Amino acid sequence: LQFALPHETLYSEVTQVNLPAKSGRIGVLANHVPTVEQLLPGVVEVMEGSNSKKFFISGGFATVQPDSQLCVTAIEAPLESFSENIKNLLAEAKKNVSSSREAAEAAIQVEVLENLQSV
């Protein structure tokens, strides 16, 4: 129902949602204040009573509704059952490109990569 990627859409009833907002992590739920927030490149999680399931994400937008529905959008995304050496070898080429407008895009890679390392 409400949590979509441009190629694969995911979730539908929720009891707790954890998001990596623009300014620090936050947690929506049962009844929450209607809010919109840029979603930083970080992990997320869903809830159904006592169910733990965490995803990673590229970034995008979250939007809590007055009618109470939370809508979360990202681009790319299971936790460790998804993303070590695949990250390592890439991190090498990443840091390398930074020393190079072109190398500016690599700056974006350093922060996104360093984050993923912690998982």
Binding site: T9, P34, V36, A62, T63, Q65, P66, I75
Partner: protein
């Protein structure tokens, strides 16, 4: 109506019916591929535009036109270009960026000095966010996107498989966002150009959704059209087949008489 002719005539139709039936079957599979990109884009349209639902943001106009470079698909480009001129009556001086050539070709002929930018190499595969961001970026770049009073994307919406629909949808620039009637309800924390970005990024997202729907509406059309081509060339084949047998037959008799008469003397 010689035999020589009718034969080769009848061939090139069989050869056409082959191609058209290939076309149909090829589009059908291509519609399967573009079905999944029309659910995953019309879903990212949910989370995005939902914020707007609250701000009820209500709209130098920027019209973006969407089709492809490909012909052979009926009135996809023809009747979208008409709704674009229908709306281009009420503002004769509105800038256009076109995605796909066939629409550009169409408008280039009628509002020749409206268009300022144009994109191509599109309706070949299913569109991806990557494009939708790069075009939005370039719309921001050269086109000066945020600095526009109004922006609307024009695309072909797919109503069924047999029929599509020329459609419009509003992009809401920054400012409007700040003056959102129900924007106060959202405890969104003015830290530097924040509505600008949302615009700059709703232009990309909206455009995608449009492109995804337009392409998947076009594929449906191509399929349906090509299908019917096969039905017609099918029925034609039947006719020419009958005519062929007539000619053959007579060819035999007129050829035979020549001999018979030759023989009596």
């Amino acid at each position: 109506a010689t035999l020589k002719e009718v034969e080769m005539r009848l061939k090139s139709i069989k050869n056409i019916e082959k191609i058209t039936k290939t076309m149909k079957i090829v589009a059908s599979t291509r519609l399967s591929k573009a079905e999944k990109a029309k659910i995953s884009a019309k879903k990212m349209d949910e989370a995005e535009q939902l914020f707007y639902k609250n701000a009820e943001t209500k709209n130098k106009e920027l019209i973006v036109a969407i089709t492809s470079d490909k012909g052979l698909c009926g009135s996809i480009h023809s009747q979208l270009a008409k709704a674009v001129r229908r709306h281009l009556n009420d503002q004769p001086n509105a800038d256009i960026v076109t995605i796909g050539d066939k629409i550009k070709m169409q408008l280039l002929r009628t509002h020749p000095n409206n268009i300022k930018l144009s994109i191509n190499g599109i309706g070949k595969d299913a569109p991806t966010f990557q494009e939708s961001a790069l075009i939005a970026d370039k719309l921001l770049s050269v086109m000066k996107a945020g600095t526009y009073p109004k922006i609307s994307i024009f695309y072909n919406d797919p109503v069924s498989s047999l029929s599509f629909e020329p459609s419009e949808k509003p992009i809401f620039n920054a400012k409007t966002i700040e003056q959102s009637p129900s924007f106060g309800k959202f405890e969104i924390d003015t830290d530097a150009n924040v509505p600008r970005d949302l615009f700059e990024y709703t232009l990309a997202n909206q455009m995608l959704t449009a492109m995804a729907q337009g392409y998947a509406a076009e594929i449906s059309a191509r399929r349906n059209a090509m299908d019917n081509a096969s039905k017609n060339a099918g029925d034609m084949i039947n006719r020419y087949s009958i005519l062929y047998n007539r000619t053959r037959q007579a060819v035999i008799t007129n050829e035979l008489v020549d001999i018979i008469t030759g023989a009596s003397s």
